[PDB]
Amino acid sequence: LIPIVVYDIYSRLLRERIVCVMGPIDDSVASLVIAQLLFLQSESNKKPIHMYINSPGGVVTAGLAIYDTMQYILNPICTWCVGQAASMGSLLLAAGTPGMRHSLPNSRIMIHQPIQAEEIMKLKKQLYNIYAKHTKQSLQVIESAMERDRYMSPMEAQEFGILDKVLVHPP
Amino acid sequence: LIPIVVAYDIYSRLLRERIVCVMGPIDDSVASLVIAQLLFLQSESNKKPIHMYINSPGGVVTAGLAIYDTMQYILNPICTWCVGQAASMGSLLLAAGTPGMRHSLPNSRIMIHQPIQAEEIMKLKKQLYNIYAKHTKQSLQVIESAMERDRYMSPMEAQEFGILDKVLVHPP
Amino acid sequence: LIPIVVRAYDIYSRLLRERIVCVMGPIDDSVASLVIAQLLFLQSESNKKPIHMYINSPGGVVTAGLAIYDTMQYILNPICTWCVGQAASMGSLLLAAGTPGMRHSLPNSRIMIHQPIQAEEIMKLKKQLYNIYAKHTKQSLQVIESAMERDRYMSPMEAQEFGILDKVLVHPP
Amino acid sequence: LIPIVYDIYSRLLRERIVCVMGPIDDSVASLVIAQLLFLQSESNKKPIHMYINSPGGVVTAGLAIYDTMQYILNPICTWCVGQAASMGSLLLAAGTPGMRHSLPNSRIMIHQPIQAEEIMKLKKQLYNIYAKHTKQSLQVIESAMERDRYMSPMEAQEFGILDKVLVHPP
Amino acid sequence: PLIPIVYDIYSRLLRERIVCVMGPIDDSVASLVIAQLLFLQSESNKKPIHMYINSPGGVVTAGLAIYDTMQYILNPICTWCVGQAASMGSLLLAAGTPGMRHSLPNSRIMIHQPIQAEEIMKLKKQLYNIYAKHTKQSLQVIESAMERDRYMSPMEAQEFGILDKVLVHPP
Amino acid sequence: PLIPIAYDIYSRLLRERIVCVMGPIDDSVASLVIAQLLFLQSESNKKPIHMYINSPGGVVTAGLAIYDTMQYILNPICTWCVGQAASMGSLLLAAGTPGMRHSLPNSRIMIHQPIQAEEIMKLKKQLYNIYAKHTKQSLQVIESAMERDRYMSPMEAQEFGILDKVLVHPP
Amino acid sequence: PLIPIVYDIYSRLLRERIVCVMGPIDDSVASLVIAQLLFLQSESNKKPIHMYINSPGGVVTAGLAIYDTMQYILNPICTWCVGQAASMGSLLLAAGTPGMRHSLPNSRIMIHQPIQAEEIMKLKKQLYNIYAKHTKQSLQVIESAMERDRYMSPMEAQEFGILDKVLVHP
Amino acid sequence: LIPIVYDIYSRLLRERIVCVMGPIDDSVASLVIAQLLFLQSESNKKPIHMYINSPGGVVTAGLAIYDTMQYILNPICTWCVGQAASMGSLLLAAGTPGMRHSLPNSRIMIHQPIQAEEIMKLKKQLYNIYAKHTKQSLQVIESAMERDRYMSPMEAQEFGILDKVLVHP
Amino acid sequence: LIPIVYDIYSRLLRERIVCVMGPIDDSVASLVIAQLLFLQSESNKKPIHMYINSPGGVVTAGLAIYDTMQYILNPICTWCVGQAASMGSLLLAAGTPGMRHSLPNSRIMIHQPSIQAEEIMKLKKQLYNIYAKHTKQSLQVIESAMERDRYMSPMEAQEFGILDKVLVHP
Ligand SMILES: CC[C@H](C)[C@H]1C(=O)N(Cc2cccc3ccccc23)C[C@@H]2N(C(=O)NCCCC(F)(F)F)CCC(=O)N12
Ligand SMILES: CC[C@H](C)[C@H]1C(=O)N(Cc2cccc3ccccc23)C[C@@H]2N(C(=O)NCCCC(F)(F)F)CCC(=O)N12
Ligand SMILES: CC[C@H](C)[C@H]1C(=O)N(Cc2cccc3ccccc23)C[C@@H]2N(C(=O)NCCCC(F)(F)F)CCC(=O)N12
Ligand SMILES: CC[C@H](C)[C@H]1C(=O)N(Cc2cccc3ccccc23)C[C@@H]2N(C(=O)NCCCC(F)(F)F)CCC(=O)N12
Ligand SMILES: CC[C@H](C)[C@H]1C(=O)N(Cc2cccc3ccccc23)C[C@@H]2N(C(=O)NCCCC(F)(F)F)CCC(=O)N12
Ligand SMILES: CC[C@H](C)[C@H]1C(=O)N(Cc2cccc3ccccc23)C[C@@H]2N(C(=O)NCCCC(F)(F)F)CCC(=O)N12
Ligand SMILES: CC[C@H](C)[C@H]1C(=O)N(Cc2cccc3ccccc23)C[C@@H]2N(C(=O)NCCCC(F)(F)F)CCC(=O)N12
Ligand SMILES: CC[C@H](C)[C@H]1C(=O)N(Cc2cccc3ccccc23)C[C@@H]2N(C(=O)NCCCC(F)(F)F)CCC(=O)N12
Ligand SMILES: CC[C@H](C)[C@H]1C(=O)N(Cc2cccc3ccccc23)C[C@@H]2N(C(=O)NCCCC(F)(F)F)CCC(=O)N12
Ligand SMILES: [Mg+2]
């Protein structure tokens, strides 16, 4: 049951420029997030957008659709990891505007990922290049890390280049 | 949960700005909704461009062709935008946008390969060959060869092939 | 999800205000009743102004198709039929039943008159279909019978030659 | 089942009461977090009341709510009615000091009913959070969490999970 | 349903030339019955075969397959209606050797029948001709009777030409 | 569904060189029929094999597997249509040894048929050539007939070249 | 599906050195085929083994398990395609003893293929090398052909090196 | 349908071949253990051949088979055909030294696809078993088991999981 | 698929080995009890071997097997392979003193995972008394240990009195 304010709660957050990326990312979630990003951009192409991320991952092309839209719009995008960002969720976290990528202290971050053979490898290489661009790590290090079935703490994710700030309280 | 803006749900709000969404598998229900939206936008103005957002793995051939024919029939220019993917019938719709107005974002994947009686399935397949030839400007022989290859193309390859005009990282 | 336009219409209701009725998907009793109710509404708004009938359907229940057919004939309005995607089985009967001169298809549509209760009753219904197609296409009963046994689709051009429709348009005239 | 006019829960939300009920998963956590952000923007000083009746749920979803409670500036009064087990008892214990309550017949459990290394890392995060808010040593928290049992409100007060056991308002 | 052994009980009855046509008649039942008729014929093409019929009907082509095999073999076939013979069941009852078609006293018999249109009519006309042949009634009378949704007593079925003898006790 | 004796009636028929092709033809049915044809062949490569066919059709490649095995073995094969032979069932009926293709009088026979596009057409053309070979009709006539959604009587199927003899009683 | 007896019919065929590879190839099918190959080898390591193949394909590692066992045993193995051999089925067909790979005239043969990303590519490359070895075609030609979604006639498969003989009669 | 000659697996059992196929659960473990006890009583000296084609399964069921292999006196030749992942690769590695084999196209994975403390205790038992049979350090075993990947037979030989990669006898 | 030699379990039964595997319900208990009666009538002196690999099960079904083990005159050697949890560990502990074994990697749990309230407590107290009798620990220590949600290694189970011998080899 989604509560209302006199607007359902998510719509109310949307009016304050907060977009929620929650649960598994599929085509339906991607389209909704993209539609919300277009809406916020037309209200103002300068004011920051806040992206709340609590997700175990999802479909690669759906994640990439959101990724490309984030890059395409002019707005700065602050990413916030609460709970977890695994697989495509961690890619979206890392794709926030430099300096504006955040996690709360107990979140868990995973870049490991839990079609023809050639196509699955082409998509995998696209992920390598995107993580390399945003984290500043080499392709070899990205590949090694993505093969490891383990989560990182927020501090480790900061050291790796996935995020900028680990906040307990506002600054 | 579909979010609302103030009462419009997010897609209806996009529709008021002349953006139509073609998302997920294309069946008769999706085709009818898209067609109804195209008729609405045309009556508001038969000159102002229409934006078509495409993120689809494909679908039913006749439903795809219904949308295709309606796109051609209306007078408006139609800008097509590939985000995520356009496979099978999705890539046909992408290619059918107004010349010069067919776009993809940088990490999209495009497939023209295709994943009721035998004679009828071949007749539909030949209709697809002729439509791709018209809009890509490639020969029928090249279309037939390419459609037999089970693979995706990058946006740059799709541009070289004639499926789209522009690969944009940021607006122009 | 059906989109809305603003004073709140869903998109099909908005099309209905412009005299467009949609016959989409399989035709059953529920679809027939909705289409019939819409035809009665449009008639009372004006019994002279044309009605546009959008048809994209693989067919359906014979008596439900016949209910829509009879209502189309009964109202006074001219009815323009438009085949987009496909009109198979009962869908092609409705297409053929539009006002003469006002039956249209877009260029890539597919049209089928082949059809994919006690034995005597199924034959009686089949003969009613033969007579309706004969009336509207102007073909003989023998030719209708032969054609309906062939499991195939027709292009819009072939359907025009056969008498199912009048005009194949790429763009408005 | 939900009575109308605007449902009862939205009406409670207008009085700064947030409900954490049933199993805690990602969907529940997101709703609770969204409500906490709403109440904070209405006023970052006025207290928030958190009603907790829950058998527990997903660890990361519980931790997401925990972190948001700490992050906002408001004081948060926690109220245990019925039960607070597993992640539910962590949220109860995480209320503002002096403002953690239970009604008299509630049951409280800190026992907990992914790769091996990851389940242990999450378990150690829970140990440190309970130690911080209860003021008990890590060794005592670990021992208590291995015992499959519930505590009465009085026992939970003695342990440091809550501050007040009320039969009637003060 | 546990089948008792002595051979299972149906196999034991088969060794004494008794074939059972029970329940709905589909392709599987028809094949079984046909296989049994071929077996009994090879043991002796002169000795009578007893066919026990208790059936609400079934698939027309499967019924016709059994019918044609009954006619094809040389043996006399005694048909016995116990419980009921409806639709295709009553056709098989009527198709027994003349003089050898029986019912017990409380059985119920129905000739009413509870693919493209043209094909269903062609099959229906094949049924008309078969009933006319074995009952000795006109085609017009068969067609009228088959439109009536009702059962007949054994005595009425005897008068109509579906069977020869209604026995309470052996003769 | 209970077969009678375990040593069922179908195995007993197999010992007399009768193979049953019943119900929908899929890979499992084709393999069983093929295995039985190999068995009968090794018992004697001269003695005829009887193939009982009551089938609404099935998978094209499974039908073709049985077809090719029938041609490959050296035995004469008598085909018998009881009930119906539709789609791939009618192909098997037509593929019996010339002069040895039979139907009982009330059977129904259909040649109409109720993967990439190019592949479905290649298989369809293989069916055209097989029917042309065994019926002696032209490719154009086969193609026209297979588009018509209808059944044929045994007499019509005889005239068309699908079978040789329509028997009410043995010769 | 009732299996007839004489021995069930497949066991009877096994006594004449005929092994059946039918339907989708999974771990259960592979283990049965492997067990049968070990049995026939111990009866005689010289007498040929006949392998009947009618299969749309299946699990790659299960197909490779059968492949490796075929190579490992000393017996000559005659492969017979009836109906179809697609994906892993066509690999087994091609892996028969040279000169002893057969198809009946109306069979259809497909080498196109209808886990982490790196692992699926490693398995795909193992398939390329196996087809190259047994067909005598270059790796580049195998890779190009496997990307085309289409079937080959028995004659085309013979020309390609997948089989040696297309027989209408024994 | 399992063919008869004995069903085919029973026939292989009479030649001292035991099959460990598909997912390993309690039912599979009990059957394998029962077969190992049978073969041991026929002769406690003659080798036993263990065919392994398995994606893994339940840890305690794998450990039950492991302990029984060690407990009996017989030499045990392990054979990887198709794959040995997770608990399957542990059983492969637990064969008698010098008698651990793979065919050339097999895939081998030591990565693994109840309370928190208990899952770690079981994990540490696996670390010590792999260390014993491969001769690698505990630190290297731990690192390798976190990597979600398969090894070729040659890599598995270099790592100490098996002794011989044979194309032909 | 159960192999034949007798199916393999029946063959083991002829050598006085009874298998208690998987979840223990009424059906399993009745089969085990029937086997114990059979072995007893063959000889009331010769030992019986009980193989235990079980996560637990229904309390009354476990108690039925327990009572029958005590009732017959034979010595009973218990063998834990894989695991013995809940009712499984009770049966392990109930073997003849000196004849209770585990292999080295087994896991043993006496905690119960996760009828009127009074009845569930009566059954729980029956378990306390049975464990006290066979382990020789005080009932207070049994009750405390059974509240801890954890497994024991074979060595710890030996120290606790659950079993007598941890063997790597005969
Ligand atoms: C960043 C958007 C730029 C400026 C631009 C443009 O690139 N596209 C194409 C487009 C179309 C569809 C999906 C897309 C997804 C990602 C990127 C581009 C997409 C349409 C958009 N429009 C709106 O946003 N209109 C107002 C939005 C308010 C609303 F309420 F509708 F949300 C129409 C006017 C327009 O110029 N653009
Ligand atoms: C391109 C449409 C042209 C101009 C034309 C015409 O071809 N058709 C027929 C038609 C009917 C039904 C479905 C069709 C699908 C594809 C193409 C044509 C279809 C109806 C339309 N009308 C409306 O659009 N009316 C306003 C509708 C929009 C709104 F939502 F706003 F109400 C009525 C005035 C009219 O003649 N035409
Ligand atoms: C062609 C309709 C004529 C004129 C006539 C008539 O035959 N019937 C009977 C009738 C009843 C019900 C279903 C029918 C289906 C098919 C044919 C006739 C049916 C009702 C109709 N009415 C309306 O439609 N009234 C306006 C309603 C407008 C609204 F907006 F509400 F839809 C009431 C005035 C009236 O006498 N007739
Ligand atoms: C404690 C929140 C601080 C103050 C701060 C901030 O860090 N985030 C980031 C953020 C984003 C998304 C999820 C988060 C979860 C936990 C913590 C931070 C999260 C958004 C917030 N905003 C609002 O809530 N604005 C008022 C609107 C609230 C209402 F519900 F009414 F819409 C936008 C301006 C702003 O400063 N912040
Ligand atoms: C009445 C049967 C006649 C005499 C004749 C004949 O037409 N067919 C063909 C046939 C084949 C298959 C199904 C048929 C169905 C209906 C009619 C004929 C059918 C087989 C039979 N055979 C047996 O039954 N042989 C003895 C076997 C006895 C057994 F116990 F096994 F059933 C083979 C030798 C033979 O001459 N015929
Ligand atoms: C007509 C078959 C010829 C003669 C020949 C041959 O082509 N194959 C290959 C083959 C193998 C597998 C499936 C096949 C399907 C279609 C065609 C050929 C097939 C094996 C057969 N054998 C048997 O049938 N042996 C008798 C055993 C029969 C029984 F059931 F009783 F066990 C082994 C000796 C032999 O020469 N051939
Ligand atoms: C080609 C097998 C060779 C010759 C060799 C050998 O490598 N293995 C190991 C082995 C074990 C298990 C699966 C295997 C799969 C593929 C390859 C090897 C496999 C067992 C076999 N044995 C038997 O087959 N014994 C007779 C069995 C006959 C029966 F009828 F029972 F099946 C035992 C002694 C022996 O020399 N080998
Ligand atoms: C290697 C077993 C040793 C030698 C010894 C022993 O430790 N156990 C205990 C035991 C019991 C139950 C399961 C066990 C699982 C793993 C390890 C030990 C197990 C019983 C076994 N027996 C048999 O195997 N008997 C022959 C069986 C032959 C048959 F054909 F039936 F399978 C009874 C005579 C005997 O000395 N032992
Ligand atoms: C420990 C059993 C004692 C000795 C005694 C006795 O108490 N009961 C009663 C009884 C009955 C049923 C279940 C029981 C379960 C637990 C305890 C007692 C049970 C029957 C048994 N009998 C057998 O076992 N007879 C030989 C059996 C041979 C067979 F192979 F079939 F098992 C009949 C003669 C007899 O003296 N008793
Ligand atoms: Mg005793």
Author numbering:
A (entry chain D): 58 to 63, 73 to 180, 193 to 249
B (entry chain E): 58 to 63, 72 to 180, 193 to 249
C (entry chain F): 58 to 63, 71 to 180, 193 to 249
D (entry chain C): 58 to 62, 73 to 180, 193 to 249
E (entry chain J): 57 to 62, 73 to 180, 193 to 249
F (entry chain K): 57 to 61, 72 to 180, 193 to 249
G (entry chain L): 57 to 62, 73 to 180, 193 to 248
H (entry chain M): 58 to 62, 73 to 180, 193 to 248
Reproduce text from the manuscript describing this model:
However, ZG180 also promotes HsClpP for α-casein hydrolysis, which indicates that ZG180 is also a global activator for both bacterial and mitochondrial ClpP proteins. The apparent electron densities in the 2fo-fc and fo-fc omit maps unambiguously demonstrate ZG180 binding on the apical surface of SaClpP and HsClpP. A similar binding manner is observed in the ZG180/HsClpP structure. Indeed, structural superimposition of the ZG180/SaClpP and ZG180/HsClpP complexes also reveals that the α-carbon of the naphthyl motif in ZG180 is likely to be a discriminant site for introducing steric clash against the bulky side chain of W146 in HsClpP. To understand the structural mechanism that causes (R)- and (S)-ZG197 to selectively bind to and activate SaClpP but not HsClpP, we aligned our resolved structures of (R)-ZG197/SaClpP and (S)-ZG197/SaClpP to the ZG180/HsClpP structure. The naphthyl group in (S)-ZG197 is positioned in the opposite direction compared to that in ZG180 and (R)-ZG197, which results in a direct clash with the side chain of W146 in HsClpP. While though the naphthyl group in (R)-ZG197 is positioned away from the side chain of W146 in HsClpP, the methyl substituent in (R)-ZG197 can generate a spatial hindrance and clash with W146 in HsClpP, which likely explain why (R)-ZG197 cannot interact with HsClpP.
ClpP is a highly conserved protease regulated by ATPases in bacteria and in mitochondria. In bacteria, ClpP is responsible for modulating the expression of virulence factors, antibiotic resistance, and the formation of biofilms and persisters. Likewise, Homo sapiens ClpP (HsClpP), which is found in the mitochondria, is a key protease regulating mitochondrial proteins homeostasis. The dysfunction of ClpP by small molecule activators has recently been demonstrated to be a possible method of discovering antibacterial and anticancer drugs.
